[PDB]
Amino acid sequence: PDIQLLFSGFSKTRENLAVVDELLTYWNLDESESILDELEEVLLVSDFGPKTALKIVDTIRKDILAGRLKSGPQIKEALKKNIFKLLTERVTTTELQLGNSRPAVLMIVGVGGKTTTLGKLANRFKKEGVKVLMAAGDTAAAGEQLEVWAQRTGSEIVMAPRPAAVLSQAVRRAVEEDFDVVLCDTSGRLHTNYNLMEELRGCKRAVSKALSSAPNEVLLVLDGTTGLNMLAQAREFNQVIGVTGFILTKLDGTARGGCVVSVVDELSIPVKFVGVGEGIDDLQPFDAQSFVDALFP
Amino acid sequence: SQDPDIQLLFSGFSKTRENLAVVDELLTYWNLDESESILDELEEVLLVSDFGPKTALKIVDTIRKDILAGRLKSGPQIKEALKKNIFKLLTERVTTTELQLGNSRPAVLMIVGVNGGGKTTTLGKLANRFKKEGVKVLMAAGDTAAAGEQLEVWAQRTGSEIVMAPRPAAVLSQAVRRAVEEDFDVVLCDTSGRLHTNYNLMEELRGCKRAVSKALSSAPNEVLLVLDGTTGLNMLAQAREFNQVIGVTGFILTKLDGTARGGCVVSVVDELSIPVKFVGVGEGIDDLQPFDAQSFVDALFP
């Protein structure tokens, strides 16, 4: 978890949020409700969604009316703590759960971003001495793009033609050849239809048939530049297949960084990685405290 | 000037237009094999500018059908259809963007919304438009206490008269009565509002509407909801809430020069079926412009 990569990645979001400090020099009990309305609107500008911003600021209001918070600096500290709590109190661990046995199998799903993320995940595993096999289940440039990442990261790759058969072939090969992790690509569209839905579920079934412990992770890749708008496709994908974690890409230069909090809060599924740059190492594991410190240093 | 200043609109939407500029590049990669992939990418570019998921879905879905039907066969043609579909969404369902001042005077416009200061500023810039057209304006400080003082400054800058306080309904009714007696052409009313309505505030706003209609049965002629454009699509929550309290006849979307999320204009018209009547595109007093769907589309996609 590279702190300066996270810090630079959230610089545009942090710039909108910087007005919060200015706003809270103006705090006293008499002028509080107006100031908190303005605070809530600052959060909405950074894509904390209406419900998330409501609950963050509502907790602060109760604490003020109860006498627990009685200064700008104290309110600022409560804001940070409440955001940390929203990111952590309900969700399971941000860590990948690879289990006891090998191979672990990770399915990557979502609506090019997926291909890039797949490559950067492979690079992380390779750096730790882990033996990776990629599976090109997005059936045709997708397969070729994935091949470049394989060669680039020193991973092996299984290619096509039916996605389910590609995935099951890769899982079988990994079990036979003592691979530690299989990284699967899958087909997806912005709007799911019956057929695409049937295909993705069929992929999950083929994977579980080839290896009953699989998939260990289903990771949904979302474009952070769409901000809160990503919730619609996230809800849809989770209806198709049990998503175990999110990967939010392209957060670098987004001003809409509050969407990270909203997606965790609304969907009760952890964000596991954030993409904070174009570099191969710019896919970072998510940590709630580091994220909060990046928005509010 | 009932026509919008085109260069003010153009500069006002520059941040939105810069995200939307990638559309042309994207469409250079368009062909029938990758059509579905390209249109997904297109739809995502719209989402970045806060065309909301439902609005972006229906814009692009029409293009998908026209492609499958053979009507569209090129990047340029798809680009043209994109612009036309946005124009249609902005115009096919809503009533006129014009203010409806009616036959008799005074007309009465109530300004509502969450942000006292945005409302106050909008009120002042509306007044300035009326004054420039020779219209005699009376302001009513119904947001009951700096709100009243801020409005007083705008009354002065614009040469408008003002009625001040302390209950809002009584202030509004006093101003409407005064306008009828003293032959004013338009009364511009401020009202109280918060980000989240409670029972009491809700009741107060409804009480203001009732006091206004009792003082003059043709009033209010307009109920204009002022929304902060920098919150983008997030403004839909407070817009739905206000329209449940009082019959909103038009939106005013402010601070649009500060955001890339200009698609929120389309989303609000699409979702709420109520026209956007003005857009605020700068800090200048003349930077409140009357809305026109064609001009807006040309500002996003020149």
mmCIF file of all heavy atoms in Angstrom, chain A residues 59 68 162 196 263:
data_model
loop_
_atom_site.group_PDB
_atom_site.id
_atom_site.type_symbol
_atom_site.label_atom_id
_atom_site.label_comp_id
_atom_site.label_asym_id
_atom_site.label_seq_id
_atom_site.Cartn_x
_atom_site.Cartn_y
_atom_site.Cartn_z
ATOM 1 N N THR A 59 -24.986 12.033 12.166
ATOM 2 C CA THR A 59 -24.258 11.603 13.373
ATOM 3 C C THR A 59 -23.549 12.779 14.039
ATOM 4 O O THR A 59 -23.541 12.894 15.282
ATOM 5 C CB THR A 59 -23.215 10.502 13.028
ATOM 6 O OG1 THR A 59 -23.888 9.390 12.419
ATOM 7 C CG2 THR A 59 -22.477 10.035 14.262
ATOM 8 N N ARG A 68 -21.064 16.612 22.819
ATOM 9 C CA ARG A 68 -19.800 15.907 22.605
ATOM 10 C C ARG A 68 -18.841 16.621 21.673
ATOM 11 O O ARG A 68 -17.630 16.514 21.836
ATOM 12 C CB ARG A 68 -20.045 14.489 22.106
ATOM 13 C CG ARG A 68 -21.077 13.759 22.925
ATOM 14 C CD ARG A 68 -21.061 12.272 22.658
ATOM 15 N NE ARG A 68 -22.392 11.711 22.874
ATOM 16 C CZ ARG A 68 -23.300 11.584 21.913
ATOM 17 N NH1 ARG A 68 -22.999 11.965 20.685
ATOM 18 N NH2 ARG A 68 -24.496 11.077 22.171
ATOM 19 N N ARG A 162 -16.082 -21.007 -26.614
ATOM 20 C CA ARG A 162 -17.015 -20.724 -25.521
ATOM 21 C C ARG A 162 -16.326 -20.410 -24.206
ATOM 22 O O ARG A 162 -15.482 -21.207 -23.762
ATOM 23 C CB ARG A 162 -17.954 -21.909 -25.323
ATOM 24 C CG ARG A 162 -18.975 -22.067 -26.427
ATOM 25 C CD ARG A 162 -19.980 -23.154 -26.079
ATOM 26 N NE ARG A 162 -21.300 -22.612 -25.741
ATOM 27 C CZ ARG A 162 -22.335 -22.585 -26.580
ATOM 28 N NH1 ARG A 162 -22.207 -23.073 -27.810
ATOM 29 N NH2 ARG A 162 -23.500 -22.074 -26.191
ATOM 30 N N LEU A 196 -26.281 -12.809 -21.778
ATOM 31 C CA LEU A 196 -25.025 -12.481 -21.134
ATOM 32 C C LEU A 196 -25.086 -12.948 -19.685
ATOM 33 O O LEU A 196 -24.096 -13.455 -19.124
ATOM 34 C CB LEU A 196 -24.754 -10.972 -21.205
ATOM 35 C CG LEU A 196 -23.293 -10.478 -21.297
ATOM 36 C CD1 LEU A 196 -22.248 -11.478 -20.742
ATOM 37 C CD2 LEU A 196 -22.940 -10.074 -22.735
ATOM 38 N N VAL A 263 -20.223 3.410 -2.367
ATOM 39 C CA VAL A 263 -20.361 2.011 -2.800
ATOM 40 C C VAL A 263 -20.201 0.994 -1.666
ATOM 41 O O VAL A 263 -20.941 0.008 -1.607
ATOM 42 C CB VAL A 263 -19.441 1.649 -4.005
ATOM 43 C CG1 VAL A 263 -18.025 1.424 -3.558
ATOM 44 C CG2 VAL A 263 -19.964 0.373 -4.691
#
